[PDB]
Amino acid sequence: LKSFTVEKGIYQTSNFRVQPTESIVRFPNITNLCPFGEVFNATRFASVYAWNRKRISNCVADYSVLYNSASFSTFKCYGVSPTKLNDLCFTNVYADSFVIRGDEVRQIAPGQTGKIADYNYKLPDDFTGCVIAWNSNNLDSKVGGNYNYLYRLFRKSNLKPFERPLQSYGFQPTNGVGYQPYRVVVLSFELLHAPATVCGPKKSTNLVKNKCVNFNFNGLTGTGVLTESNKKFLPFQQFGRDIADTTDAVRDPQTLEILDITPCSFGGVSVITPGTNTSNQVAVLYQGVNCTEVPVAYSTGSNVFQTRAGCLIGAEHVNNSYECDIPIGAGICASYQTSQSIIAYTMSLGAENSVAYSNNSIAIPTNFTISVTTEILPVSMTKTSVDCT
Amino acid sequence: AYTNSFTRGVYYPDKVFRSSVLHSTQDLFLPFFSNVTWFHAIKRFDNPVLPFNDGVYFASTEKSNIIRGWIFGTTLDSKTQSLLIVNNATNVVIKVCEFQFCNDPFLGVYYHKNNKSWMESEFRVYSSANNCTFEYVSQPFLMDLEGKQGNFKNLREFVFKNIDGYFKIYSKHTPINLVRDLPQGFSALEPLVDLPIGINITRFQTLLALSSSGWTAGAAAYYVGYLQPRTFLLKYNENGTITDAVDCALDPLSETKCT
Amino acid sequence: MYICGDSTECSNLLLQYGSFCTQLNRALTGIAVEQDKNTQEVFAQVKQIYKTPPIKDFGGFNFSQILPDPSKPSKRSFIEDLLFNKVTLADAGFDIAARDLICAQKFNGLTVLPPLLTDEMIAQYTSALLAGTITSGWTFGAGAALQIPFAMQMAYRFNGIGVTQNVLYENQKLIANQFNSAIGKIQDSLSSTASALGKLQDVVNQNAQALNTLVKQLSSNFGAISSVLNDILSRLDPPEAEVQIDRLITGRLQSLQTYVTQQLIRAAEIRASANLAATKMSECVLGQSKRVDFCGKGYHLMSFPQSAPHGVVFLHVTYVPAQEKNFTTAPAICHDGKAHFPREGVFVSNGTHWFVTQRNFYEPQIITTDNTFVSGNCDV
Amino acid sequence: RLDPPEAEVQIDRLITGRLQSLQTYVTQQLIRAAEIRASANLAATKMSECVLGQSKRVDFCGKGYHLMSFPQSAPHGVVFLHVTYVPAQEKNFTTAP
Amino acid sequence: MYICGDSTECSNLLLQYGSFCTQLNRALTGIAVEQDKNTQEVFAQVKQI
C-alpha cells in the first residue's frame, strides 16, 4: 500500500505458488543403435585409395561406449565436441574405414602437404567430420610384411580433391612408432538432405507421482502434479487436451500408461488486519488453497481454519454469529474482538423474528417517530485535460 | 466412372486425445461429396500412373491382397530415389531406393481359374535394385488374406500424405456388408506409419499381381480420391474416437455449424 | 503467471512494462467487490429474518410453492429449485466445488473468488422478505412488521388500485382460486420451457466464453517463432530469445487488457441491472407501485421474490379487468337546475335508468346526494 | 547519446509504451465517467422527486414514509437529508373485515 | 477486410494474432442487435394496432 499505516480491511499481497520439488524427464528407451561396433571392429579395412563408405542413418549415434573405451589412441573432433554430441541431431553419417602407414596420419590433416592426401582422401578446409585413428600394429602387421597397402600414389594423371612414395618395406611387429599400421575411421556427416534421423541417446529418470514436478515427456515440457488417470487413450495417441487447448493428460513413453496433469497449487494471499492503532495483529488467507499445502511456502500455525474461500491462518474460529466486519467469502467474516484476537465466523443475516400473524389479529401503531437520514451521491469528478504530445 | 463419396476420407489429424470435444482443424482433407475415380482391378490391364496432388485417398474392396503395393516419386525410372511399398502376405517391404521400374511390372498369375492351380508365368515385379539410400522391412505379420468369397469384409481405406519431408500413411480396415460400390458409413482412419523419407513425390502408381482369348476378368476395383486443404469440424466421443465430421465449406448449413 | 508462467527471463522482461499487472488486478478486484455490493443491495433489504407462522391460514391463498421447504437440505422453495436446476453451467463448477475450482483456467493463473453470500443466505433473505410480505403487508418495509390478516392486506391492495374492498370481501374464494391457478401455471411453465431464464444463461455463457477465449489466446504466436516459451528459450539464445519473448509478452498483455476492458463493460451492464433489480424489490415487494408496467403488466397488487443463480426472479401479481360492458354515460346530472358530479365514480346507464359506479368494476348504485356533489347550474 | 538513425528505435519503443498507457487511462476514465453520469442522473431524479415533491416510491427518499428532503452541497456530490415518518409503538387488537 | 483488405499474405500474418477479429465482430454484432432491441422495447409496447 506504500503507507506506514494500513486501514482496516482485507488486502491482496504476493501470490502463493507451490514450487516444483524436482525435475523428471521420460523418453522411450534407446533401441535403434548405429552399427558403430561393426564399423570399428571390422576384421580388415579397405585400401587407402579405395576407402570403404558405409551409410549410417536411422539410429542413435551413442558415443559412451566409444569414448570411454581405452582401445582407441587418437580421436579429435575439429567441428564438434563430445559433450554436445549427445544433444545434437544429424541427418546422415558415413563411416570411411581404411588402414594407413603411421606417417600418413599427419597427411590426413586437412590442408596438409603431400599429393598422397588428395590422391587417396582429401580433407577440405570445412570438414567437421570427426576422425578416429587407433594403432592396429598386431592386426595389420604380417610376419613377412603386409605389402597390400602399397604407397605408389604418384600417378602421372592428376586427381583433383574429391574428384568423386614407396617408403614402406613391410608391415612387421618390429616396426617402430610412426611406421606401424594404423586403423583410421572417419565419421563424415552431411546436412540438408532429409529430416534429421540420427540423434544422440536421451537419458530418462525415474517416475514420480503426487508431487509438483517439472515433467518432460517426448519434448513436452511442463510443470504439474502427475496422477494415475482412468482415461483411455487410443494406441496412437500420446497427449490429452482440454476444451481450452491445454494439456491435461499424457502417456508415459517408457510404460504405456495415462497420467493426469494437474497444475501445482496456487492462489492469492490476502492479509486481514484491523487498523494499525487497533492492533498490529494480522491473519492471512490463502485464497483457494488447501490448508495442508500452505506451510510449503506462520508455517507453524496453531490456528488454521479450512474455509470454502481457502485456508485461514491466525484467526480463531468462533461459531457464534455477528454482523460481517471484514468479508472473507462463502459467508465467512473476520473481526477483532476480545485477550483481543481476530475471530472468524459465519456472519448473521439479522435477528430472528416470528411475526405473531393470525386471522383476526392486527397491529396498529400508537406513537410515531420522525427520522432524518443522510444519503450521499457523487455528482461529478475532477476535470482532466492531457496534452498527448 | 465418377463415383461420389459420402463421408469417407476422415483421419485423425494428430496424436492428441480429446473427449466430448467438437474440435475444428484446418488440414488436408478429402472434400465431402466429391468425385472419385473408379477403376477395374483386372488384354485390359488398368494400371496407369496417376498424379500425386498433395495427398491421395485410396480405397479398395479387394481380397487376398490383389493390389500389392505402390510407387511414389517424380521420375519413377531409378534416376531419382523412389519410394516402394510392395507388399504381400508376409509383410510390407518399404524401400526408398532407386529401383529400376519395368514398363510392365505385374506378377501376372492366372491362378485357380481353369484347372484350379497356382502358376507363375513371369516374375517381372522386380527388375533390379541398382542403388538405394534407405530401406525398411516390417515384421512378417499375416492379414486375413485367406480365401473367403462370401461377402466382402475388407474396405482397405488408406490416405497417403507427404508434408515437411514426412511421409504419413493413415489407414483403417472397415468391414462392409454390400459388395456393391462404397456403402454409406463413417469411420475415421487411424495413423498407421510415419516415415522420415524427405523425398519428393509428384506421381504415383499402383502394383498388381495379375492368354487374352476368353479371359475371365477378375472382380475387384479401387477408388482414387484427391485431398485438398479444407476446414473440418470433428466430433470426439467420450472415448476419443472421431464419431462424426462436418465439412465447413460444403454448404451454408455446414458453414453455420462450423461457425 | 498468465503472461510468463514459470520463466525468470520473461518475468524480468515484463518488469520493463511494470505496472500494467497492478492496474489489471486493481480493476478485477473492483469488479469483484462490485458484484458483492450488487448482491447485498439487491437482497439484504430486511433488518430482521421474519419467518412464517406454523399455521398457513392465509385467507385461502396458497403460497406453499414459494415458501421454503424444510425437508430439502437446501432450504429453497419449489420454484427456486426449479430455477436452480434450469440454470446450468458450461465449463465446470465455479457451486458444488469440494477442491480446486476444477477448471482448465487454473492452468494459467486464473481463479474465481466465491461470492460473499452463499446460496443458503440468499434463500434466507428471500424467505425473510416473502414471510414479511405475506404476514405484514408493506409495513415491514417502513418499520416494525405489523401483522394483519392476508384478506385485509389484499383489501388494502385493492383499495390501492382503486377498487372497493367489498369486491375482494365478496369474491375472496374466486380470487384465491385464481391466484393458486396462476401460481400453478407459473410452476408448470418454468418446469416445461427452457428459454425462460435466457438472461441468466446468457450471463453465464458470456463469462465462460470470455475466460475460454482468454485461455485460448495463449496458443497464438503473435509473430514469434513459437507459442511455447520453453521451446523458444531452448531453441534460441539470449538475444533473439528475448526478442521473441517480447513479442509474446506484448501479445498476451494485449489479450489481458482486452479481457479486462470487456469485463469492465459487462460489469457496468450487470450493475445497471442490479440497481434496477434492487429498485424493483423495494418498490414492488416492499410496497405497492403505481408506476405503470413497472411491477408487471396490469394494476400491480404484490410481488414475491425468488432467488436464482446470479440473479433474482419476481413473481408480479396484477389485477386485470376481464369482461367489459358499454353503457351510455354523461359527465354530470341535472336535478333542480343544479349540476351533480360523481364523488368517486362515473355515471352510466343500461338504457333506461341512470346509476353511478366505480370506474374499475361495474357496481351500479342509485344516484343519491351522498354519491355526488353539486357545483354550478345546468347550462355550463 | 545515440545518433538519429539508431535513436529512432528507442524513441519508437517509448512512444508505443506511453501511447498504450494513455489509451488505458482514457478508457478507464471513460468507464468511470459513465458510472458517474449514472450516479448524477440518479441524484437529479432524487432531487426532483424528493425535494421538489413528496415521493410515494418506497425506500427511494429514505427509509420509512417520506415526508420531505433537504439538499446539501458536498465536494463533487450532493447530500440529501430525508425526513421520514416511522411508526414506533404498536398496540395490537382483534380485527374483522 | 479492414486490416488486410484483399491480401492473402496479410491475412495469413493476421491469423497468428488469435481471435481478435472474431471478438471485434462479436462485439459489433451485439451492438447492432441491441439497437433493434432498444427500438422494440421503446415502441412495440401494445400488440394491437
Ligand SMILES: *[C@@H]1O[C@H](CO)[C@@H](O[C@@H]2O[C@H](CO)[C@@H](O[C@@H]3O[C@H](CO[C@H]4O[C@H](CO)[C@@H](O)[C@H](O)[C@@H]4O)[C@@H](O)[C@H](O[C@H]4O[C@H](CO)[C@@H](O)[C@H](O)[C@@H]4O)[C@@H]3O)[C@H](O)[C@H]2NC(C)=O)[C@H](O)[C@H]1NC(C)=O
Ligand atoms: C336498468 O336498471 C334499472 C334498475 O332500476 C331497470 O329498471 C327496472 O327496475 C325494477 C325494479 O325497480 C325491476 O323489476 C322490478 O321487479 C319487481 C319484482 O320482480 C322481481 O324480479 C326483478 C327482476 O329484475 C327484480 O329486479 C325485482 O327487484 C323483483 O325481485 C316488481 O315488483 C317491480 O315493479 C316496478 O314497479 C313498481 C310500481 O311502480 C315499483 O314499486 C317497483 O319498485 C318496480 O319499479 C319491478 O318490475 C326491473 O327488472 C328493472 N328492469 C330490468 C330490465 O332489469 C331497467 O329496466 C334497466 N334497463 C335496461 C335496458 O336494462
Ligand SMILES: *[C@@H]1O[C@H](CO)[C@@H](O[C@@H]2O[C@H](CO)[C@@H](O[C@@H]3O[C@H](CO)[C@@H](O)[C@H](O[C@H]4O[C@H](CO)[C@@H](O)[C@H](O)[C@@H]4O)[C@@H]3O)[C@H](O)[C@H]2NC(C)=O)[C@H](O)[C@H]1NC(C)=O
Ligand atoms: C367472473 O370471472 C370468474 C373467473 O373467470 C368466473 O368464475 C367462474 O366461472 C366459471 C364459468 O362461468 C363458473 O363455472 C364453474 O367453473 C368451474 C371452474 O372454474 C367448474 O369447475 C365448475 O364446475 C362445472 O363445470 C366444470 C367444467 O370443467 C365441470 O368439470 C364440473 O363437473 C361442473 O359441471 C363450473 O363450470 C365458476 O363457478 C365461476 N367460479 C367463481 C365465480 O368462483 C365468473 O363466473 C365470472 N362471472 C361473475 C363473477 O359474475
Ligand SMILES: *[C@@H]1O[C@H](CO)[C@@H](O[C@@H]2O[C@H](CO)[C@@H](O[C@@H]3O[C@H](CO[C@H]4O[C@H](CO)[C@@H](O)[C@H](O)[C@@H]4O)[C@@H](O)[C@H](O)[C@@H]3O)[C@H](O)[C@H]2NC(C)=O)[C@H](O)[C@H]1NC(C)=O
Ligand atoms: C398448495 O399448492 C401446492 C402445490 O400445488 C399443493 O401441494 C401439492 O401440489 C401437487 C401438484 O399440484 C399436488 O399433486 C400431487 O399430489 C400427490 C399425492 O397427493 C399429495 O398431496 C395431497 C394434498 O394435495 C396429500 O394429501 C397427499 O398425502 C400427498 O402428499 C403427490 O405425490 C405429488 O407429488 C403431487 O404433489 C399435491 O396433492 C399437493 N399436496 C402436497 C402435500 O404435496 C398444496 O396441496 C396446495 N394446498 C396447500 C394447503 O398448500
Ligand SMILES: *[C@@H]1O[C@H](CO[C@@H]2O[C@@H](C)[C@@H](O)[C@@H](O)[C@@H]2O)[C@@H](O[C@@H]2O[C@H](CO)[C@@H](O[C@@H]3O[C@H](CO)[C@@H](O)[C@H](O)[C@@H]3O)[C@H](O)[C@H]2NC(C)=O)[C@H](O)[C@H]1NC(C)=O
Ligand atoms: C402484538 O401483541 C402480541 C401480544 O399480544 C397478543 O397478540 C396480539 C397479536 C394481539 O392479538 C393482542 O390482543 C394479544 O394479547 C405480541 O406478539 C406476541 O409476542 C410473543 C413474542 O414476543 C409471541 O410468542 C410469545 O413470546 C413470549 C416471549 O418469549 C413467550 O413468553 C410466550 O409464551 C409466546 O411464546 C406471541 O405468540 C405473540 N402473539 C400473542 C397472541 O401473544 C406482539 O409483540 C405485538 N405486536 C405485533 C406487531 O405483533
Ligand SMILES: *[C@@H]1O[C@H](CO)[C@@H](O[C@@H]2O[C@H](CO)[C@@H](O[C@@H]3O[C@H](CO)[C@@H](O)[C@H](O)[C@@H]3O)[C@H](O)[C@H]2NC(C)=O)[C@H](O)[C@H]1NC(C)=O
Ligand atoms: C524400457 O525398458 C524398461 C524395462 O524395465 C521398461 O520399464 C519396465 O520395467 C519392468 C520391470 O518391472 C519391465 O519388466 C516388467 O516387469 C513387470 C513386473 O514383473 C511385468 O509385469 C512386465 O510384463 C515386464 O516384464 C518391463 O519390461 C518394462 N516395461 C516395458 C514396456 O518395457 C520400459 O517401459 C521400456 N520403455 C520403452 C520400451 O519404451
Ligand SMILES: *[C@@H]1O[C@H](CO)[C@@H](O[C@@H]2O[C@H](CO)[C@@H](O[C@@H]3O[C@H](CO)[C@@H](O)[C@H](O)[C@@H]3O)[C@H](O)[C@H]2NC(C)=O)[C@H](O)[C@H]1NC(C)=O
Ligand atoms: C410519543 O413518542 C415520543 C418519543 O419519540 C415521546 O417524546 C417525549 O418527549 C418528552 C420530552 O423530551 C419526554 O419527557 C421527558 O420524560 C423524562 C422521563 O424520565 C423526563 O426525565 C424528562 O425531563 C422529560 O420530561 C417524554 O419522556 C417522551 N415520551 C416518550 C414515551 O418517550 C412522546 O411523549 C410520546 N407521546 C405519547 C402520547 O406517547
Ligand SMILES: *[C@@H]1O[C@H](CO)[C@@H](O[C@@H]2O[C@H](CO)[C@@H](O[C@@H]3O[C@H](CO)[C@@H](O)[C@H](O)[C@@H]3O)[C@H](O)[C@H]2NC(C)=O)[C@H](O)[C@H]1NC(C)=O
Ligand atoms: C466407449 O464409450 C462407451 C459408451 O459410450 C463406454 O461404455 C462402455 O462400453 C462397453 C462395451 O463393451 C460396456 O461393456 C460392458 O461389458 C459387460 C460385460 O463385460 C456387459 O455386461 C455390459 O452390458 C457392457 O456391455 C461397458 O459396460 C460400457 N460402460 C462403461 C462404464 O465402460 C466404453 O467404456 C468406452 N470405452 C473406452 C475404452 O473408453
Ligand SMILES: *[C@@H]1O[C@H](CO)[C@@H](O[C@@H]2O[C@H](CO)[C@@H](O)[C@H](O)[C@H]2NC(C)=O)[C@H](O)[C@H]1NC(C)=O
Ligand atoms: C567391438 O568393440 C567394442 C569396444 O568398444 C567391444 O565392446 C566393449 O567396449 C567397452 C568400451 O566401453 C569395453 O570396456 C569392453 O572391454 C569391450 N568388450 C570387449 C573387448 O570384449 C566389443 O567387444 C567389440 N566386439 C568384438 C571384438 O567382437
Ligand SMILES: *[C@@H]1O[C@H](CO)[C@@H](O[C@@H]2O[C@H](CO)[C@@H](O)[C@H](O)[C@H]2NC(C)=O)[C@H](O)[C@H]1NC(C)=O
Ligand atoms: C381464521 O379466522 C378465525 C380465527 O381463527 C377462524 O374462526 C374460528 O377459529 C377457530 C379456531 O381456529 C375455529 O375452531 C372456528 O371453527 C372458527 N370459527 C368459524 C369457522 O366460524 C377461522 O376458521 C379462520 N379462517 C377464517 C375466519 O376464514
Ligand SMILES: *[C@@H]1O[C@H](CO)[C@@H](O[C@@H]2O[C@H](CO)[C@@H](O)[C@H](O)[C@H]2NC(C)=O)[C@H](O)[C@H]1NC(C)=O
Ligand atoms: C513378401 O514380403 C516379404 C517382406 O516384406 C518378403 O520377404 C523378403 O525377404 C528377403 C530377405 O529374406 C528380402 O530381401 C526382401 O526384401 C523381402 N521382400 C521381398 C518382396 O522379397 C517376401 O519374399 C515376400 N513374398 C513371400 C511369399 O514371402
Ligand SMILES: *[C@@H]1O[C@H](CO)[C@@H](O[C@@H]2O[C@H](CO)[C@@H](O)[C@H](O)[C@H]2NC(C)=O)[C@H](O)[C@H]1NC(C)=O
Ligand atoms: C486438502 O487435502 C485433503 C487430503 O486429505 C482433502 O481431504 C480429503 O482427503 C481424502 C483422502 O484422504 C479424499 O478422498 C477426499 O476427496 C478429500 N476431500 C476433498 C478433495 O474434498 C481436503 O478436502 C483438501 N482440501 C481442499 C480445500 O482442497
Ligand SMILES: *[C@@H]1O[C@H](CO)[C@@H](O)[C@H](O)[C@H]1NC(C)=O
Ligand atoms: C485509531 O484511532 C481512533 C481514535 O482514537 C480510534 O477511534 C480507533 O480505535 C483506532 N482505529 C483503528 C482502525 O484502529
Ligand SMILES: *[C@@H]1O[C@H](CO)[C@@H](O)[C@H](O)[C@H]1NC(C)=O
Ligand atoms: C462450533 O460448534 C462446535 C461444537 O463442538 C464448537 O466446538 C466449535 O466452537 C465450533 N466448531 C468448530 C470447528 O470450531
Ligand SMILES: *[C@@H]1O[C@H](CO)[C@@H](O)[C@H](O)[C@H]1NC(C)=O
Ligand atoms: C461427378 O460427375 C458426374 C457427371 O458429371 C456426376 O454424375 C456427379 O454428380 C459428380 N459427382 C459429385 C459429387 O458431384
Ligand SMILES: *[C@@H]1O[C@H](CO)[C@@H](O)[C@H](O)[C@H]1NC(C)=O
Ligand atoms: C490351367 O492352369 C493355370 C493355373 O495353374 C491357369 O492359369 C491356366 O489358365 C489354365 N490353362 C489355360 C489354357 O488357361
Ligand SMILES: *[C@@H]1O[C@H](CO)[C@@H](O)[C@H](O)[C@H]1NC(C)=O
Ligand atoms: C546410386 O545409383 C546409381 C546406380 O548405378 C549409381 O549412380 C551409383 O550406384 C549411386 N550413385 C550415387 C549415390 O551418387
